[PDB]
Coordinates of C-alpha atoms in Angstrom, one line a residue:
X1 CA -31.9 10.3 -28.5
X2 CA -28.1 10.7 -27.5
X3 CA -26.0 8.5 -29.0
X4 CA -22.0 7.1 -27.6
X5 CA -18.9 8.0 -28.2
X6 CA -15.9 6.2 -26.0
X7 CA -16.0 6.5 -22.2
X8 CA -15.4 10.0 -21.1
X9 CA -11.7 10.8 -20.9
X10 CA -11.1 8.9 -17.6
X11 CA -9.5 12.1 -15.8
X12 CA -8.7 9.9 -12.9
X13 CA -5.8 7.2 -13.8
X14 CA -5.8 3.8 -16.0
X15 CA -5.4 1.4 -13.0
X16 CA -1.7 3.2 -12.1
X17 CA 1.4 1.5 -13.0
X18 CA 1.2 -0.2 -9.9
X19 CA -0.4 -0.4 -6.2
X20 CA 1.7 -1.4 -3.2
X21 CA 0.5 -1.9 0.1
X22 CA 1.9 -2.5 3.6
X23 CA -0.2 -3.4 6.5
X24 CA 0.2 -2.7 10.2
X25 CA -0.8 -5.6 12.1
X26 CA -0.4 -5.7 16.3
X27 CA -0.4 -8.3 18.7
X28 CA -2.1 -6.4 21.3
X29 CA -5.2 -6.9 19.2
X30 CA -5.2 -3.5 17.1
X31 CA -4.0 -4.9 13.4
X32 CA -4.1 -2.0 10.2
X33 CA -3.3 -1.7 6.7
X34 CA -1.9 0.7 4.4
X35 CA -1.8 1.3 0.7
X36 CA 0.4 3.5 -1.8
X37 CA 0.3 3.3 -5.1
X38 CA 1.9 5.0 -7.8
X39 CA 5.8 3.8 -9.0
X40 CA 6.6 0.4 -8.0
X41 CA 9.5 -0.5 -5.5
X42 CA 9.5 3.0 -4.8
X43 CA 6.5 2.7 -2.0
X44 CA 8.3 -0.8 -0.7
X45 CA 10.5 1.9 0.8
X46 CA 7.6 4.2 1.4
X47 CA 6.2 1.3 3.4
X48 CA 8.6 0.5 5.6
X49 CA 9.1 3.8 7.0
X50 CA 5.4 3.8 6.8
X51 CA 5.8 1.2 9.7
X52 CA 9.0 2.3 10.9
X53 CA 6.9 5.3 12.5
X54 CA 4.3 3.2 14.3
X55 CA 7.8 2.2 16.0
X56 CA 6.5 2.7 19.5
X57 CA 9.0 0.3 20.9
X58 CA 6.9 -2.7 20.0
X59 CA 9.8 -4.4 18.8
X60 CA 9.9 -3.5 15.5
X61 CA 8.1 -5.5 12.6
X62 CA 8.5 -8.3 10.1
X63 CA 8.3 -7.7 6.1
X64 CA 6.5 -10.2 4.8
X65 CA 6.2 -10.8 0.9
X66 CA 3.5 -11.8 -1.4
X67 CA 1.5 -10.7 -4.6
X68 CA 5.3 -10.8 -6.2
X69 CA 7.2 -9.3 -3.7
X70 CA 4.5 -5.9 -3.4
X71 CA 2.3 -6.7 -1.0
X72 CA 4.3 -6.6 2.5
X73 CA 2.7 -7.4 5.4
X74 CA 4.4 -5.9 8.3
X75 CA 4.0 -7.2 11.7
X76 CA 5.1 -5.8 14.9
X77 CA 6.1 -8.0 17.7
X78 CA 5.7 -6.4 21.2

């Protein structure tokens, strides 16, 4: 019989400070998404040069702005 003892030192990460997430979407029909967590504003920057090289003269994007300002949903033209 093997008893408990507290959840095994969770060697992964308590739920990070806090995920972002930027998404690719296209109007040719191809939409995407992205994700990086880890600081906070920090990947908001991260982000939009996350979109800034799928720049393959669609026209550039729109950042959108929900879930507080984190989630950006960034949609090319073209």
């Amino acid at each position: 019989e093997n008893k408990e003892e507290t959840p095994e030192t969770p060697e992964t990460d308590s739920e990070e400070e806090v995920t972002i997430k930027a998404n690719l979407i296209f109007a040719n029909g191809s939409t995407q998404t992205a994700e990086f967590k880890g600081t906070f504003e920090k990947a908001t920057s991260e982000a939009y040069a996350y979109a800034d090289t799928l720049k393959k003269d669609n026209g550039e994007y729109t950042v959108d702005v929900a879930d507080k300002g984190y989630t950006l949903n960034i949609k090319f033209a073209g």
